[PDB]
Scaffold this active site. Structure first.
Site, short mmCIF file in Angstrom:
data_model
loop_
_atom_site.label_atom_id
_atom_site.label_comp_id
_atom_site.label_asym_id
_atom_site.label_seq_id
_atom_site.Cartn_x
_atom_site.Cartn_y
_atom_site.Cartn_z
N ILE A 23 0.84 -1.19 0.00
CA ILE A 23 0.00 0.00 0.00
C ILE A 23 0.88 1.25 0.00
CG2 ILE A 23 -1.57 1.38 1.43
CD1 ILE A 23 -3.17 -0.81 2.05
N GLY A 24 1.85 1.29 0.90
CA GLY A 24 2.72 2.45 1.01
C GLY A 24 3.72 2.24 2.13
N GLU A 25 4.61 3.22 2.30
CA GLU A 25 5.63 3.13 3.34
C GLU A 25 6.06 4.52 3.78
OE1 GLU A 25 8.96 0.99 1.85
OE2 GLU A 25 9.49 2.46 0.31
N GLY A 26 6.42 4.62 5.06
CA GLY A 26 6.98 5.80 5.63
C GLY A 26 8.46 5.64 5.93
N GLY A 29 8.45 2.46 8.53
CA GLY A 29 7.32 1.55 8.52
C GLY A 29 6.76 1.36 7.13
N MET A 30 5.97 0.30 6.98
CA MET A 30 5.33 -0.06 5.73
C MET A 30 3.88 -0.43 6.02
SD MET A 30 6.25 -2.89 2.77
CE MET A 30 7.79 -2.06 2.40
N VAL A 31 3.02 -0.18 5.03
CA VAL A 31 1.59 -0.47 5.13
C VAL A 31 1.20 -1.41 4.01
CG1 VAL A 31 -0.72 0.44 5.42
CG2 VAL A 31 1.27 1.91 5.97
N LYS A 46 -0.09 -1.77 9.36
CA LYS A 46 1.11 -0.94 9.36
C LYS A 46 2.18 -1.62 10.19
CE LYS A 46 1.18 3.42 11.00
NZ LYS A 46 0.93 4.88 10.94
N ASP A 141 0.36 16.80 10.93
CA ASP A 141 0.88 16.41 9.62
C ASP A 141 -0.26 16.03 8.68
OD1 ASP A 141 2.93 15.99 7.70
OD2 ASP A 141 3.04 13.85 8.24
C1 LIG Z 1 -3.36 1.47 -3.64
N1 LIG Z 1 -4.33 0.76 -2.81
C2 LIG Z 1 -3.66 0.33 -1.61
C3 LIG Z 1 -5.42 1.65 -2.45
C4 LIG Z 1 -5.15 2.48 -1.18
C5 LIG Z 1 -4.34 3.60 -1.16
C6 LIG Z 1 -4.14 4.30 0.04
C7 LIG Z 1 -4.77 3.90 1.21
C8 LIG Z 1 -5.58 2.76 1.18
N2 LIG Z 1 -6.31 2.24 2.33
C9 LIG Z 1 -5.87 2.37 3.69
N3 LIG Z 1 -6.63 1.85 4.62
C10 LIG Z 1 -6.29 1.94 5.89
C11 LIG Z 1 -5.11 2.57 6.24
CL1 LIG Z 1 -4.75 2.57 7.99
C12 LIG Z 1 -4.32 3.12 5.22
C13 LIG Z 1 -3.11 3.82 5.35
C14 LIG Z 1 -2.40 4.21 4.22
S1 LIG Z 1 -1.00 5.11 4.73
C15 LIG Z 1 -1.36 4.93 6.40
C16 LIG Z 1 -0.37 5.58 7.34
O1 LIG Z 1 -0.37 5.46 8.51
N4 LIG Z 1 0.52 6.29 6.44
N5 LIG Z 1 1.48 6.98 6.67
C17 LIG Z 1 2.49 6.42 5.90
C18 LIG Z 1 2.40 6.68 4.39
O2 LIG Z 1 2.27 8.03 4.08
C19 LIG Z 1 1.15 8.53 4.71
C20 LIG Z 1 1.14 8.26 6.22
C21 LIG Z 1 -2.55 4.25 6.55
N6 LIG Z 1 -4.73 2.99 3.98
C22 LIG Z 1 -5.77 2.08 -0.01
#
Ligand SMILES: CN(C)Cc1cccc(Nc2ncc(Cl)c(-c3csc(C(=O)NN4CCOCC4)c3)n2)c1
EC number: 2.7.11.24
Length: 333
Positions: A23-26, A29-31, A46, A141
């Protein structure tokens, strides 16, 4: 079959959570999303690896304690926490939360928002932020990549690692001297509003000097009263060295936006934090009249307070508190 991995990163969350997706990463950490074979749904996980640095340890403990106390529809919760059975073994902490469809960042990369959706998203951001600030907590933030959206247009604020009791494109100008007050959050929401109106960051500086120039390029040169808010000496000197800049009216930047939307944006993106609008007055602004409903806008029962001085604690102490706080999710508690 051993533990799961996502982009060379081990993700030791089975047997309950499987079928992982990046999904993503900081910074630390990674999500991912995963399949929860108990509740038969997909969830967000996360992974957090903070223990090398005292700062990461404070933010992780803060994130966990705040999110476990807060209970609000527009704020991400914590459903489960996974970590090793012994403190010696704990290198990572995995926080499990509701999976959302996307974030506002990605939405604004591909979609044009009707005035109605902009209004509805703004309402929810501020409705969550009202609960947050009512508890005397600052997010600090807010940005499109941590505003989560559902299929049904529901919005949740996430990532409270930087939250505290009371890019860089969304930083208030007070911070680019540095003083974290509730108004830095309103600044961020202002910038988010602008971006929803145009699909492009309003103050996209390559660095803080260049961000200040973008800000002044629209707000115009700060007044003397406004200059008395800028405590830092290098910053104050810099601002005094610049040629005059005229204020650009908002409807020249957003020629097709709702007038009320622009009037609120003006009050959120005010240089002087003391004159910047506050979250309740924002919610009560005419632009938001279609959704403002104080009878269904919960606030926190009491101010959140940490009973320990996290800043003072060595990273070893913090790790023990993190072990403690996560105990209640460990089997056999
Ligand atoms: C591409 N496909 C994955 C679709 C998509 C795209 C973005 C989000 C989600 N759903 C989702 N559901 C629940 C959560 Cl809990 C999160 C979440 C994303 S990031 C984060 C956090 O804590 N992120 N930090 C580190 C990264 O930079 C920002 C801050 C929490 N996302 C689905």
């Amino acid at each position: 079959a051993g533990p799961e991995m996502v982009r060379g990163q081990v993700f030791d969350v089975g047997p309950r959570y499987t079928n992982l997706s990046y999904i993503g990463e900081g910074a630390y950490g990674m999500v991912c999303s995963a399949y929860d074979n108990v509740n038969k749904v997909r969830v967000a996980i996360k992974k957090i690896s903070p223990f090398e640095h005292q700062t990461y340890c404070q933010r992780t403990l803060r994130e966990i304690k705040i999110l476990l106390r807060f209970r609000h529809e527009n704020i991400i919760g914590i459903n489960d926490i996974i970590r090793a059975p012994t403190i010696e073994q704990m290198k990572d902490v995995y926080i499990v939360q509701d999976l959302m469809e996307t974030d506002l960042y990605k939405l604004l990369k591909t979609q044009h928002l009707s005035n109605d959706h902009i209004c509805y998203f703004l309402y929810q951001i501020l409705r969550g932020l009202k609960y947050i600030h009512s508890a005397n907590v600052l997010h600090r933030d807010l940005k499109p990549s941590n505003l989560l959206l559902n299929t049904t247009c529901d919005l949740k604020i996430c990532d409270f690692g930087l939250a505290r009791v009371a890019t860089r494109w969304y930083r208030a100008p007070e911070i680019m001297l540095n003083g974290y007050t509730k108004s830095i959050d309103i600044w961020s929401v202002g910038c988010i509003l602008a971006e929803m109106l145009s699909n492009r960051p309003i103050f996209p500086g390559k660095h803080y000097l260049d961000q200040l120039n973008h800000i002044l390029g629209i707000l115009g040169s700060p007044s003397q009263e406004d200059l008395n808010c800028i405590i830092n000496l290098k910053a104050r000197n810099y601002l005094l060295s610049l040629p005059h800049k005229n204020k650009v009216p908002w409807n020249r930047l957003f020629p097709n936006a709702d007038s009320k939307a622009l009037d609120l944006l003006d009050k959120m993106l005010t240089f002087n934090p003391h004159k910047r609008i506050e979250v309740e007055q924002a919610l009560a602004h005419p632009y938001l009249e279609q959704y403002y409903d104080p009878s269904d806008e919960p606030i926190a029962e009491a101010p959140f307070k940490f009973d320990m001085e996290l800043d003072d604690l060595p990273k070893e102490k913090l790790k023990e508190l993190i072990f403690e706080e996560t105990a209640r999710f460990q089997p056999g508690y």
